[PDB]
């Protein structure tokens, strides 16, 4: 913020397939055209998430499908679709989570409440603590499936 515009933790400058610089966070897997900026992590964060399970999930079943049979590839395709829909403005995170998340948290519009380190699967935890308030992750893979994470607090 002061006299410096170093990129925040996990952020790096990359070149898009179509020729424009963009920014990628290697911890949250988020990609955006906007420069992310221009100190330790938070002690606790509150996040909501949208989970898309697949046949190789630890528990290949959910409230919206007793037997999950989609491949991991298909799951990623859906995740990328939801991310694109949210970024476009045609859909909002909460609505999509309540309708399509394979996690029971869908009942709470994806809200998982607040948590500390050591309470969620590592990849999910790493992404969550690297997000700033209001930020959304890119595709995050865990033994549960593929997630889209939104930090609310």
Swiss-Prot record:
Description of post-translational modifications: Phosphorylation at Ser-61 by DAPK1 results in inhibition of its catalytic activity, nuclear localization, and its ability to induce centrosome amplification, chromosome instability and cell transformation. Ser-61 is dephosphorylated upon IL33-stimulation of dendritic cells.
EC assignment: 5.2.1.8
Source organism, top-level taxon: Eukaryota
Keywords: Acetylation, Cell cycle, Cytoplasm, Isomerase, Nucleus, Phosphoprotein, Rotamase
Summary of the tissues where the protein is detected: Expressed in immune cells in the lung (at protein level). The phosphorylated form at Ser-61 is expressed in normal breast tissue cells but not in breast cancer cells.
Effect on the protein of changing residue 103 to A: Loss of peptidyl-prolyl cis/trans isomerase activity; decrease in DNA repair of double-strand breaks by homologous recombination slightly less efficient than that observed with wild-type protein. No effect on RBBP8/CtIP
Reaction(s) this enzyme catalyzes, per UniProt: [protein]-peptidylproline (omega=180) = [protein]-peptidylproline (omega=0)
GO BP field: cellular response to hypoxia; negative regulation of amyloid-beta formation; negative regulation of cell motility; negative regulation of ERK1 and ERK2 cascade; negative regulation of protein binding; negative regulation of protein catabolic process; negative regulation of SMAD protein signal transduction; negative regulation of transforming growth factor beta receptor signaling pathway
Localisation per UniProt entry: Nucleus; Nucleus speckle; Cytoplasm
Domain annotation WW: ranges: 5-38
Pfam family, one: Rotamase
One Gene Ontology MF term: ubiquitin ligase activator activity
Residue ranges of domain PpiC in the record: 42-152
InterPro entries in alphabetical order: PPIase_dom_sf, PPIase_Pin1, PPIase_PpiC, PPIase_PpiC_CS, WW_dom, WW_dom_sf
Positions of modified residues (Phosphoserine): 61, 98
GO terms under cellular component: ciliary basal body; cytoplasm; cytosol; glutamatergic synapse; midbody; nuclear speck; nucleoplasm; nucleus
Assembly and binders: Interacts with STIL. Interacts with KIF20B. Interacts with NEK6. Interacts (via WW domain) with PRKX. Interacts with BTK. Interacts (via PpiC domain) with DAPK1. Interacts with the phosphorylated form of RAF1. Interacts (via WW domain) with ATCAY; upon NGF stimulation. Interacts with PML (isoform PML-4). Interacts with BCL6. Interacts with FBXW7, disrupting FBXW7 dimerization and promoting FBXW7 autoubiquitination and degradation. Directly interacts with RBBP8/CtIP; this interaction depends upon RBBP8 phosphorylation.
Role description: Peptidyl-prolyl cis/trans isomerase (PPIase) that binds to and isomerizes specific phosphorylated Ser/Thr-Pro (pSer/Thr-Pro) motifs. By inducing conformational changes in a subset of phosphorylated proteins, acts as a molecular switch in multiple cellular processes. Displays a preference for acidic residues located N-terminally to the proline bond to be isomerized. Regulates mitosis presumably by interacting with NIMA and attenuating its mitosis-promoting activity. Down-regulates kinase activity of BTK.
Domain notes: The WW domain is required for the interaction with STIL and KIF20B.
The protein's name: Peptidyl-prolyl cis-trans isomerase NIMA-interacting 1
Biological source species: Homo sapiens (Human)
Lineage: Eukaryota, Metazoa, Chordata, Craniata, Vertebrata
